[PDB]
Design a protein around this ligand. Structure first.
Ligand SMILES: OC[C@H]1O[C@@](CO)(O[C@H]2O[C@H](CO)[C@@H](O)[C@H](O)[C@H]2O)[C@@H](O)[C@@H]1O
Ligand SMILES: OC[C@H]1O[C@@](CO)(O[C@H]2O[C@H](CO)[C@@H](O)[C@H](O)[C@H]2O)[C@@H](O)[C@@H]1O
Ligand code: CA
Length: 1003
């Protein structure tokens, strides 16, 4: 049972020997001999091709074997194959860390497969440099050959590097290049409020049931309560919060309570709580929110009782739509509407360039109040007004100045870029001709601060330079505007008149406290109160001789000395903070002040005419009575009389005694030292703000920025874009300081007697880290389906799960207290939902079920993998378990080597019988199927073309690299199974000389 050679002591291995009628084969490994006539085809044998197909099957359908989201696969999915073709030669069982790209073995179509090949060659160096680009009409057997080559080379590089880090990077660079897996398939569009280039709304589906909702009532603003009109746009930025969901409404009330009790809750400090709210982005959320805030303020503070109790919680709305005020009035003015009619009237008549400004009459009429003869109180809708804001006429223009100074694209910049752009912006601000800055700021502010029936709001960026550390550098307007502000406290009260004469000159008059009309003789205090204002927008203004401008100061101001507050000059303006050296004018017996093209009593700049300089383009002059005492205070304290009417705020002299300060810019820089922190510095200046007549300080939103860079808010970290609703400089400082600095700022403000406003931002949330498969439809900013988009009821990977430790710590936690203390809040039916808030479920973590949708994320229409027929692949979690065919376990009945009669056939991948071909098995042997499809296994010399002489043992294996000793001589078959003739050969140590018939001569 061994055949050794007795002379050389060597055994013969892989040797077939004839012993009479007996045939003995001595095997490869040990030379162990066995009856050659009894060798049988191993019926468990598989082909080399079959092993390749099986190695690439998924190890399993568990979460760890196949990277997924809710069971769905993505173009980025890596998986654990059953076997790894290690170093591109040896099939080896996979470990659980042997994850591989699904795109190494599967493609959505053969076009993509071909692009994959060209990309892996050109960018991965995974195929020979000089190989033709693969074509659209590329053969599928050619594509498959070279896909296997790529596999082999990938495993080769993985072996030299011991890593797939390079491969994660390369595959995602490749993915990113396909239209179906990038923004090209998302219909990028910036129309309306698609500030980030597009929206996807969340829709109910059986495929993604955990993200379904009974609510998602969209666009339901003050003009669209029932849902039958268009309303404002529901969609704005980032992840849009579904505020029509009763459970979400309860969570907004929870958060509102937190802000109003922030100092108690976070530091046991009753002096560190906010006093009011700014409702941010009102026209972008369910208007039910205005009613929920009202009801809570009514239960906690008794807002509607009297002016005294209401005015102790000044609240304002960011409500841009022109039909909003009537609505705000209808529901009790729980928060002040803005007067956008009036702000626009200022933009149109003062704030434009000399050749853009319109006649000044509109300042009198285009407003919630007609100011021709404003001589009553409690008769109009109460409002706040303003000239600029952190966004309005600041953020766009500043980004223009940044782009112009640096050359970078719009809205992209680093801190050096901001600074250079700020330099350019401030130079523009200080020119006569302005490109990025508003004109006539002195006049605009004079209108702002002398209007009756208005709570004016002063903007930080008009007192201090927008870019820089908090309060670092003053604007050119600081003296002018603060002069106006202290003058407002001291003199501005009572009735108002406005008219525009024949020369287009506006005269604006306040009578002082105790007089509503020009005919009222007023009280004691009236005498040295009131104000007279002359404005023109005509840089070329010239009055003709004799012509004049009359201010009708009134019957309380007959034969009286007035002195200048502000005069226009050639290069600017002159400010006078009191009576010293201020030019004078005298009223006549009628109380009329007269100006002409001539100076009064030889005093320079007391004549009326046009100027054009960095402050004034047109004309500004402001006059008050002389000889007011230095402590004169013209304000009116709110009455604690019971309200006859269901409202909170009333438009009167007490409300008119309030000034809001918007105390930030988007462009405040990050502090370089703790003393530079906005909120520390706010704490140091509360008396300064009080001196200006500021009664409420509007703080920036204090939520920690997402810092994700997906919008201006998360570039300069203003606080409008955040992940965690309850993290107010707590996890780490916000741009303005720690939560400690915040509390100290609030406590210091309260010490001065100032209120403080929390910016309430219930529209949206940014940068949630947890992925979620959601059925989405591409849509405009109202959620109207984008008709040309193929993204329609399509599963899509969203970033919708998370919210921070503070949302987790506090979400829903005060709902108990609220039920206990104010049960009345939980019984109110709100107008859009027509049911109550729902406190029975606490939100401690966000997921898609609580969102109306998201900006487009640039993952691509096809990112979530589906078969040709539209069926989604899935592990089995969210829908039917269905995996690609190359990952799936295949039925092998009829495939591979099948016995039929006394023959073995081989049926290929298409179940095709193979004829006249060699097939290699997974362990290295070759087999030949003859022209009839029949495995040869007869142990006889046979001629085969592709001619050579082959011999196949009874188990069908091609005999090869060995000797055959028959009674008629010995033959040698080479490494390819072909008989050798007529040469000397060497196989290892053995040398074999063969003649022309193949017979062995010597060895
Ligand atoms: O900022 C873009 C755009 O948003 C509006 C919406 O009213 O501004 C308010 O809401 C945004 C998201 O909360 C903030 O970016 C913005 O600062 C805030 O005032 C529009 O005013 C502004 O044009
Ligand atoms: O808001 C109306 C406005 O949206 C536009 C472009 O911003 O169209 C989008 O919204 C449509 C509503 O019918 C989709 O059907 C459409 O595919 C998409 O362009 C404007 O056409 C339309 O005036
Ligand atoms: Ca919204």
């Amino acid at each position: 049972q061994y055949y050794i050679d007795p002379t050389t002591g060597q055994p013969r291995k892989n040797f077939l020997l004839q012993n009479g009628n007996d045939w003995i084969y001595f095997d490869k490994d040990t030379g162990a001999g066995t009856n050659a006539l009894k060798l049988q085809f191993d019926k468990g044998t598989i082909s080399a091709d079959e092993q390749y197909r099986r190695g690439n099957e998924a190890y399993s359908y568990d979460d760890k074997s196949i990277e997924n989201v809710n069971g769905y696969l993505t173009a980025d999915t890596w998986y654990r194959p059953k076997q790894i073709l290690k170093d591109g030669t040896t099939w080896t069982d996979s470990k659980e860390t042997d994850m591989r790209p699904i795109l190494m073995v599967w493609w959505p179509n053969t076009v993509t497969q071909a692009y994959y090949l060209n990309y892996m060659k050109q960018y991965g160096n995974l195929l020979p440099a000089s190989l033709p680009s693969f074509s659209t009409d590329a053969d599928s057997a050619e594509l498959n050959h070279y896909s296997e080559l790529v596999q082999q080379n990938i495993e080769k590089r993985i072996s030299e590097t011991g890593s797939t880090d390079w491969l994660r990077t390369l595959m995602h660079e490749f993915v990113t290049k396909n239209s179906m897996w990038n923004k090209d398939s998302e219909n990028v569009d910036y129309g309306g409020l698609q500030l980030q280039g597009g929206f996807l709304k969340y829709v109910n589906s059986d495929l993604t049931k955990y993200a379904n909702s009974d609510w998602r009532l969209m666009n339901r603003t003050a003009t669209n309560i029932d849902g039958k009109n268009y309303g404002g746009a529901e969609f704005l930025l980032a992840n849009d919060i579904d505020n029509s969901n009763p459970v979400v409404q309860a969570e907004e009330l929870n958060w509102l309570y937190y802000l109003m009790n922030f100092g108690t809750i976070t530091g046991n400090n009753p002096e560190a709580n906010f006093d009011g709210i700014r409702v941010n982005a009102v026209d972008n959320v369910d208007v039910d929110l205005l009613s929920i805030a009202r009801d809570y303020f009514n239960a906690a503070y008794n807002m509607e009782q009297s002016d005294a109790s209401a005015n102790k919680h000044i609240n304002i709305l960011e409500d841009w739509g022109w039909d909003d005020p009537a609505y705000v009035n209808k529901i009790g003015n729980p928060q002040l509407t803005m007067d956008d009619r009036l702000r626009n009237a200022i933009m149109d008549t003062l704030s434009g360039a000399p050749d853009k400004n319109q006649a000044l009459n509109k300042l009198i009429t285009q407003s919630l109040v007609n100011r021709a003869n404003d001589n009553t109180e409690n008769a109009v809708i109460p409002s706040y007004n303003f000239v600029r804001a952190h966004d309005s006429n600041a953020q766009d223009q500043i980004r223009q100045a940044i782009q112009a100074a640096t050359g970078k694209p719009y809205g992209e910049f680093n801190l050096d870029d901001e600074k250079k752009g700020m330099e350019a912006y401030i130079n523009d601000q200080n020119s006569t001709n302005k490109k990025w800055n508003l004109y006539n700021m002195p006049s605009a502010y004079t209108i702002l601060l002398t209007n009756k029936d208005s709570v004016p709001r002063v903007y930080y960026g008009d007192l201090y330079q927008d870019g820089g550390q908090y309060m670092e550098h003053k604007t050119r307007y600081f003296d002018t505007i603060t002069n106006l502000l202290k003058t407002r406290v001291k003199y501005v009260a009572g009735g108002q008149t406005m008219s525009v004469d024949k020369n287009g000159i506006l005269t604006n008059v306040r009578f002082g406290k105790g007089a509503m009309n020009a005919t009222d003789t007023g009280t004691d205090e009236t005498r040295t109160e009131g104000i007279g204002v002359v404005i023109s927008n005509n840089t070329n203004l010239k009055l003709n001789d004799g012509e004049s401008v009359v201010l009708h100061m009134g019957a309380a101001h007959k034969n009286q000395k007035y002195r200048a507050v502000i005069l226009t000059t050639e290069d600017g303006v002159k400010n006078y903070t009191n009576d010293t050296d201020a030019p004078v004018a005298y009223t006549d017996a009628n109380g009329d002040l007269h100006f002409t093209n001539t100076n009064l009593d030889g005093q320079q700049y007391t004549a009326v005419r046009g100027y054009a300089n960095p402050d004034v383009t047109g004309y500004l002059a402001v006059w008050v009575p002389a000889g007011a005492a230095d402590d004169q205070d013209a304000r009116t304290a709110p009455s604690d009389e019971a309200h006859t009417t269901k409202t909170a705020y009333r438009s009167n002299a007490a409300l008119d005694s309030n000034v809001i300060y918007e105390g930030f810019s988007n462009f405040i820089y990050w502090p370089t030292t703790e003393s530079e922190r906005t909120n520390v510095r706010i704490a140091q200046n509360a008396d300064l703000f009080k001196s200006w007549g500021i009664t409420t300080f509007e703080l920036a939103p204090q939520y920690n920025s997402s810092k994700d860079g997906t919008f201006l808010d998360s570039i300069i970290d203003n606080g409008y874009a955040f992940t965690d609703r309850y993290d107010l400089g707590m996890s780490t400082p916000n741009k303005y300081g720690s939560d400690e600095d915040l509390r100290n700022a609030l406590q210091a403000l309260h010490k001065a007697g100032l209120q403080a406003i929390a910016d309430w931002v219930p529209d949206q949330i940014y940068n949630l880290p947890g992925k979620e498969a959601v059925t989405v439809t591409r849509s405009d900013d109202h959620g109207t389906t984008w008709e040309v988009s193929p993204i329609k009821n399509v599963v899509y990977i969203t970033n919708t799960i998370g919210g921070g430790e503070y949302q987790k710590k506090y979400g829903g936690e005060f709902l108990d207290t609220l039920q206990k203390e104010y049960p009345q809040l939980f019984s109110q039916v709100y107008p859009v939902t027509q049911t109550t808030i729902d406190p029975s479920v606490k939100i401690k973590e966000w997921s898609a079920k609580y969102f109306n949708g998201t900006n487009i994320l640039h993952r691509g229409a096809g990112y979530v993998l589906r078969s040709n027929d539209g069926k989604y692949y899935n592990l089995g979690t969210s829908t039917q378990q269905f995996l690609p065919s190359q990952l799936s376990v295949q039925d092998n009945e009829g495939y591979g080597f099948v016995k039929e009669g006394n023959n073995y056939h081989y049926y290929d991948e298409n179940k095709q019988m193979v004829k006249d071909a060699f097939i290699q098995d997974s362990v290295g042997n070759w087999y030949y199927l003859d022209k009839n499809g029949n495995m040869v296994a007869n142990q006889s010399p046979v001629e085969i073309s592709s001619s050579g002489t082959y011999l196949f043992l009874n188990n069908g294996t091609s005999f090869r690299s060995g000797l055959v000793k028959t009674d008629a001589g010995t033959y040698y078959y080479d490494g390819d199974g072909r008989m050798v003739r007529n040469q000397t050969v060497s196989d290892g140590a053995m040398t074999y000389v063969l003649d022309e018939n193949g017979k062995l001569v010597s060895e």
